[PDB]
Amino acid sequence: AEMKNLKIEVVRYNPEVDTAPHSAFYEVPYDATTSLLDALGYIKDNLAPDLSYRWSCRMAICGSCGMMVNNVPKLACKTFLRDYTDGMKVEALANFPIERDLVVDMTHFIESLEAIKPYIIGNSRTADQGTNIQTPAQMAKYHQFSGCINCGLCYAACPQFGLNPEFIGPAAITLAHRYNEDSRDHGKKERMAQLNSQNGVWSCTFVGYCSEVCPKHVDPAAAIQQGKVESSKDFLIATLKPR
């Protein structure tokens, strides 16, 4: 038959030529199955070979996809043209320095994630003794918070992070909370200093937009509030320890 077309606006930026980002526009064929990621490949293949962007899985599980679509942080592989017939403007993930086209520097995210020690700490059990015992009830405590694909859409959604680039952010705190809440870990004290910082949970004013955009429904906002409760219990304990 005859495929419809869609004029997509993509905010290009070449640090070796441009002084600032600037829009470009492309005509792309499409149907009810076409995704933003599909569209970007079509552009790179037939209209502008210098269009750079991150991607891989094509199924919303790897998390390398994040970008802004009409000012809403989304995954290009889970965004569909059929929903943007009245206009679609694509930009690099907000609140992150733009390196080139749709690629942004994720270094702060990575360092933030690294700073909260996201690994089982202090459990002496060894392989030969078998695995730990953990029940559905114990796992339910942190399970949802472990679905994070590190895509960064919550950092683009958070206005607190945009105002304070030093804030360790929603995903990082959720990740920390995921280990604190795991019955097999015993390293909550190794994580608290970062969660108690001003750049920790306390930089959060519960705008709640992060949770609204998580493509994996992790609900980082709930993690942070819960973290606040623990940070507060921690503050009391510290105040009462003249030891």
Binding site: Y13, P15, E16, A20, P21, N71, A94, P97, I98, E99, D105, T135, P136, A137, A140, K141, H143, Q144, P159, G162, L163, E181, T205, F206, V207, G208, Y209, E212, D219, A221, A222, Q225, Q226, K228, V229
Partner: protein
Amino acid sequence: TTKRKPYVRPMTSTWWKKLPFYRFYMLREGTAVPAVWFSIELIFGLFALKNGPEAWAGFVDFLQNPVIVIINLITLAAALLHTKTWFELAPKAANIIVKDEKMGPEPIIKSLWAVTVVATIVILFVALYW
């Protein structure tokens, strides 16, 4: 030397005017104002109460304005919006497991509203039926 030139977009004081989700957030925190204003009002009344009936009547006169009646009606609206949003948010601070499943928020949101309702009734009874 690097050929990279990282472009940092700036964040304006009007960031929140964009998206409705941000606007509603601003509105939510905005309830803070009518709420403190009401605390101030109570302090007037409390010190008018102490300065005798003469002063108390001058307080009641103020509340009659009736521009102050509008502000107070706005205050009531703001307070309810606070209650509405406070109750949805509070449950997230708890992580409760009920038979292998993380529950809430609905069970908690329902209880808080139940308690408010009862409280609103007990106060109104106490302050008006006697």
